[PDB]
Amino acid sequence: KRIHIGPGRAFYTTXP
Amino acid sequence: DLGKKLLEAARAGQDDEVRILLANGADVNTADETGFTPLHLAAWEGHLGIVEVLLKNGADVNANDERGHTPLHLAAYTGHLEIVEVLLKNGAGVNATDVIGTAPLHLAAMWGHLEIVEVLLKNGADVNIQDKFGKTAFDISIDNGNEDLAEILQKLN
């Protein structure tokens, strides 16, 4: 998974 | 209106303008479409002084954006150690989880934010928390190849 974080375009991933 | 300005001022690190807007009645807990409050944005951008002002002015330390991220999640991910500490000083949920079970310790561990992981653990961070895919913070540090961090998060039993 791609999980967006913060007010920008950043994202963290865990698994898919 | 006033909430919008307060969001941008917190984002831009304009400590004086944040104080002005609060004095003129700006909702310290105003939220944009994504759910970010001024305290979210100050923690994300690293503006410790504004975080302090917002918290003294009644900011919700545990406000969730639409992804379940609190200001402590954002400070943990962005590596803002001073802000992490201040939030924890103000009762931030150290084990708060976003919509897929990710806690600040995971986010700190991701980027090898060594000192932040230590502060989170000092304030009751649970190393055994797993996100929806079974990943602990220790697991993340192994996956990312961060040796020094694994030793600090290591469980023995």
Residue numbers in the entry:
A (entry chain C): 5 to 20
B (entry chain A): 13 to 169
Which text from the study accompanies this structure?
The V3 loop of the HIV-1 envelope (Env) protein elicits a vigorous, but largely non-neutralizing antibody response directed to the V3-crown, whereas rare broadly neutralizing antibodies (bnAbs) target the V3-base. Challenging this view, we present V3-crown directed broadly neutralizing Designed Ankyrin Repeat Proteins (bnDs) matching the breadth of V3-base bnAbs. While most bnAbs target prefusion Env, V3-crown bnDs bind open Env conformations triggered by CD4 engagement. BnDs achieve breadth by focusing on highly conserved residues that are accessible in two distinct V3 conformations, one of which resembles CCR5-bound V3.
Using the Designed Ankyrin Repeat Proteins (DARPin) technology, we previously developed the V3-crown specific DARPin 5m3_D12 that shares features with cross-neutralizing V3-crown Abs and has activity against difficult to neutralize (Tier-2) strains of HIV-1 subtype B27. Notably, 5m3_D12 partially by-passes V1V2 shielding, suggesting that generation of DARPin based broadly neutralizing V3-crown inhibitors may be possible. Due to their rigid interaction surface, DARPins often bind to a specific conformation of their target, as exemplified by the cross-neutralizing V3 DARPin 5m3_D1226,27,31. Exemplary for this, 5m3_D12 displays a strong binding preference for a specific V3-crown conformation. 5m3_D12 and 63_B7 were co-crystallized with V3-IY (MN). We only noted a potential effect of glycosylation on 5m3_D12: Introduction of a glycan at N197 strongly decreased sensitivity, conversely the T388A substitution (and to a lower extent also N386A) led to a decrease in sensitivity, suggesting that loss of this glycan may lead to altered structural dynamics of the V3 loop that do not favor 5m3_D12 binding. In support of this, the V3-IY conformation preferred by 5m3_D12 was only rarely sampled in a V3 MD simulation on deglycosylated gp120.
